[PDB]
Design a protein around this ligand. Structure first.
Ligand SMILES: *C(=O)[C@H](C[C@@H]1CCNC1=O)NC(=O)[C@H](CC1CCCCC1)NC(=O)c1cc2ccccc2[nH]1
Ligand SMILES: O=C[C@H](C[C@@H]1CCNC1=O)NC(=O)[C@H](CC1CCCCC1)NC(=O)c1cc2ccccc2[nH]1
Lengths: 304, 301
């Protein structure tokens, strides 16, 4: 099999990216049917970013203040409104490339693909996880705002993320497609701290299963443990609590490998207390936590 | 900025992927214009896998033995031929979604995106490098063959890889779109040893520049070294030799950081001799070698 950070194919999403300009600022927009979704901070001027009032700022705009370009074709804005931190720009043309889609809000620990965009043009795709502190470790440069994160279920594109800003620590913060920030962040250029991050334990375990599925077994041991005994050690290493739901989600991986979840927990416990001693798992010398159980299954099962 | 294993957006290639069925074997094809490209071992029976004579196998086939499906639309094969290890199926319909494309053969150390596909249907995109041993550390499962590796410049897709097989060590082998295998491998179910893989030094240095550009500088040192001095140490750690060309290719990154290439080499040499010692660079506890200088400049600019 082999194991790689694998994103969803980005084709269905590249067909929705447009460029949105308001005044001097240009950022990406998401064009679904006759609505373009973009960060509401496009309506902000540099003399306004420290504490904008977006209702004030949006009342002073007309439709002709928004230039929306789909490639070379300019879309005429017919209406606009604000839903939380996203601006919705109603345009006179529905997107012929609109895929089956939904807006979903993901949970910390969950992964998604990010189609990084500039001037409405897709430039790269990578896999991300919503960190426990509700930040993402993305790769974004100036102009990336409005790039979206998404998962694909068969033909359905589940948009879960729109990029708004970079925190001073260099991680990234954004909203779901309903404009609601992940985590306690606000769209103001103010001091904003991401809380302390933690390791997504269930994903480390999923990744350890993927290692066994792929023949890296050196870290396995004859020992088991209880959930509660494992979680006592997990807390010391800044690892998220492991719940019975996590154990139950790891079942299919447990079944394919014949290794009990609590047995894998005892292996992780020993990895944490002893380290890898310079050894590698799946080509990494640290415990990877940005693979969910479903990620592992799909890459080890061939889902299309 | 942030740093991530980033692949090219894959839509332009998704529009070219098809299912190719010959007998009992189903794998993926690349449909550009009126031609469908796929691995030739699609014509192999399980019995003929150990020692196939593809010229014999293809002579005994007709156009109607090749079932090409684009979505649920069946494509009619009008002609077939073999160019080395790839089969070229002429179909009666030119792909409407055909991008601007070229076929290119990449060098060791260069990277590309892989659109893993099953039954013609794109399932995932990831970044790869052509290792020095001409193998790729891929993620593929049964039905992956025909999956293509590619780079996108402007609107042009440069196809550089087509998936053919997994070596017993679990790395992967394949050909360019002209059917020439990368490395000394052949499409026969025989014992085939990939050579000793080595680390792509020029890419490790590029990634160390990415790291500096992203504020990770703990590994930097006041020391400098000559290319020949560095190479004496590189050899001992299974690292590729570094050339003045590599030095020159790393110029842009050296410029944007103000760190001389041979200064960064002095950092790498110390990282090799002492190790990271529990420290991390760009979220990695390993020196990463799958980012070319161009990858780094594109992601960091
Ligand atoms: C959108 O295109 C960019 C995305 C940033 C740019 C660089 N890397 C990214 O992820 N968004 C911004 O630049 C925001 C714009 C603000 C407008 C007003 C509402 C909040 C967002 N600014 C930042 O992301 C930003 C400014 C800043 C200053 C000092 C430290 C950190 C910091 N982050
Ligand atoms: O879809 C095509 C697959 C891709 C494989 C499948 C699993 N992971 C991959 O990358 N190719 C294959 O399955 C090809 C089949 C083809 C037949 C004719 C001669 C050339 C090879 N076979 C192989 O890769 C293979 C690996 C291997 C390891 C040990 C012993 C025999 C082996 N065979």
């Amino acid at each position: 099999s082999g194991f790689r950070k694998m994103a969803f194919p980005s084709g269905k999403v590249e067909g929705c990216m447009v460029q949105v300009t308001c005044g001097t600022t240009t950022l990406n927009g998401l064009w679904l049917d006759d609505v373009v979704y973009c960060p509401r901070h496009v309506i902000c001027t540099s003399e306004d970013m420290l504490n904008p009032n977006y209702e004030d700022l949006l009342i002073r705009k007309s439709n002709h203040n928004f230039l929306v370009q789909a490639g070379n074709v300019q879309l005429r804005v017919i209406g606009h409104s604000m839903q939380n931190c996203v601006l919705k720009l109603r345009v006179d043309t529905a997107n012929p490339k609109t895929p089956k889609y939904k807006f979903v809000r993901i949970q910390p620990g969950q992964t998604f693909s990010v189609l990084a965009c500039y001037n409405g043009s897709p430039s790269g795709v990578y896999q991300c996880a919503m960190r426990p502190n509700f930040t993402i470790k993305g790769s974004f440069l100036n102009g990336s705002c409005g790039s979206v994160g998404f998962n694909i279920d068969y033909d359905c594109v589940s948009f879960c993320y729109m990029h708004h800003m970079r925190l001073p620590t260099g991680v990234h913060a954004g909203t779901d497609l309903e404009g609601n920030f992940y985590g306690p962040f606000v769209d103001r250029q103010t001091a904003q701290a991401a809380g302390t991050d933690t390791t997504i334990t269930v994903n480390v375990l999923a990744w350890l299963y993927a290692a066994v599925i792929n023949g890296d077994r050196w870290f396995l041991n004859r020992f088991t443990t209880t959930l509660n005994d494992f979680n006592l050690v997990a807390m010391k290493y800044n690892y998220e609590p492991l719940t019975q739901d996590h154990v139950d989600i790891l079942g299919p991986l447990s079944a394919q490998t014949g290794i009990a979840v609590l047995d894998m927990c005892a292996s992780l416990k020993e990895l944490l207390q002893n380290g890898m001693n310079g050894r590698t798992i799946l080509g990494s010398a640290l415990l990877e936590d940005e693979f969910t159980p479903f990620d592992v299954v799909r890459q080890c099962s061939g889902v299309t």
